[PDB]
Each structure stands twice: as C-alpha cells, then as structure tokens.
C-alpha cells in the first residue's frame, strides 16, 4: 500500500478500511493510530509499504519523515531513518522523500525507510548534486505574475486592483500592513486562487500560523 492514499482520505474511509481489515472498534483512536494499525494489518499479510515525508533532523543525529496530516509533527505515522542514510544520500531538513518503508520491526515503534525512490520529486543522482541555497546569487523579478483571472466576477476586483496597485513578481519580498478584521483572509484566498489559475506550474504554499 501507499501512505498518501491513506493521507487524502477522511476519517470515515479509514473506519471502513479497518472494518475491511477485520479490526477492533477503531473510532476511538487518532487518524494516525488508525493508519498505523491498518498498515500493520496489511504488512502482516507479507506486504511492503510506500511512504512520503518531509525530512527533519535534531542534534540526535537520525531523521524523521513527517506528513502533512499533523502539519509536520511527531506521530505514529512518521518514518525514522538512520544517520547513515542522511550521510550517504546527502539528506537534510526540508528534503521531502518518497519511497519504500516498512512497519516497525521487533522492538521498534516507528516506520523505517528501505529504499529511496523520489528525493524532492527527483532521482538521487541530481538530488545529491544540489546547489546550496545561501551559496546562490539573488536577483530581481522580470517574470510578472499576472494576478488577473480574466473572468471578471464580483470578487476578482481584489485581484485585478493589484495589477494596478502592487505588481507581483517571482521571488518578491512582500509584506502586508493591515489592522485586524479588514479582509486579509479573503485577500490571500483570492491571491492563491489567482496564482493557481494563471500559474499552475509553481508549487503553492500557504502558512497558517496561530
């Protein structure tokens, strides 16, 4: 099985999947506990697991592959990897890794990676030959990120006005100065929708903090 297909489904799907697996009443546990139990039941039939997680390292040396279900926190679904793999495949924090994983073996309690398959959606060849971030040279934006949708609905105003108020470019350092209860939530909703419609190639990221 793959972990992402347990990721994208809601809780009721996990409930019926566990009922298919002939499991005890599982409505009481966390979603990650249900995923852990289902993966254990699946591997008990002699099966391997496929997982995907963003990598994080502490001073302890070994690494943890977190999922987006808990917004990248510790959990029974995260994968434990030895420092040897980090030393070999040149891993570091933030490097999302997808590949073969196994349930925790005798005495273990978290998953362990077997073979890397996709390092940041890339083969380990060019992943090991990665240019350093701070070693790069910053520039300015010529690629104009068009905020206009072109449909011209009732709310599209808040986007098109930026096309004449604040131009947006790739790599721009932008900051909003606004009082509370003014309309920033729908504003960022609009900007996300507009950039996804006009530029679906760039990976979207939104930070919801506090």
């Amino acid at each position: 099985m793959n972990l992402t297909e347990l990721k994208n489904t809601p809780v009721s799907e996990l409930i019926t999947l566990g009922e298919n697996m002939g499991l005890e009443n599982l409505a009481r546990m966390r979603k990650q506990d249900i995923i852990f139990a289902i993966l254990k039941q699946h591997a008990k039939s002699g099966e391997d697991i496929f997982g995907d997680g963003v990598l994080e390292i502490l001073q302890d040396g070994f690494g943890f592959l977190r999922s987006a279900d808990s917004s990248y926190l510790a959990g029974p679904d995260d994968i434990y990897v030895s420092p040897s793999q980090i030393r070999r495949f040149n891993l570091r924090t933030g490097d999302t890794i997808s590949g073969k994983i196994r349930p925790p073996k005798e005495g273990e309690r978290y998953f362990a990676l077997l073979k890397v398959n996709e390092v940041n959606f890339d083969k380990p060849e060019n992943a090991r030959n990665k240019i350093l971030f701070e070693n790069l040279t910053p520039l300015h934006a010529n690629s104009r990120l068009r905020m206009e949708r072109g449909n011209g609905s009732t709310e599209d105003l808040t986007a098109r006005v930026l096309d004449l108020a604040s131009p947006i470019g790739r790599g721009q350092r932008g900051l909003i100065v606004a009082p509370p209860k003014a309309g920033k939530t729908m504003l960022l909703q609009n900007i996300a929708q507009s950039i996804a419609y006009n530029h679906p190639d760039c990976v979207l990221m939104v930070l919801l903090i506090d």
Binding site: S82, S84, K105, L114, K115
Partner: protein
C-alpha cells in the same frame, strides 16, 4: 610432559572467543533482516558483550 601451562595471553584469547561467539550469534540473528543498501557494517556490532 602431560601438563600444559597457559599464560595470560591464552586465557585472554579464550575469553575473547567466548565473547565473540555471543557477538557472532547476535550479528547472525540481526543479519536475518539486513539487505543491500540499508546499513553500514557498524550498527550490527555492539561493544557490550566482548
């Protein structure tokens, strides 16, 4: 001629082998899961027994 003398080195080597047989059993029972591209020849050996 029928009584043999053993020094500190011989008994030290004997105790080393006594510990090495335990370490060997451990590395054998751990090698039951080890496959290619999963571990360096350092984690499978513990210093405790010998």
């Amino acid at each position: 001629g029928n009584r043999r003398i053993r020094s500190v080195g011989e008994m030290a080597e004997n105790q080393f082998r006594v510990g090495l047989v335990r370490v060997e059993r451990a590395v054998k029972e751990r090698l039951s899961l080890g496959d290619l591209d999963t571990l360096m020849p350092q984690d499978m050996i513990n210093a405790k027994p010998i």
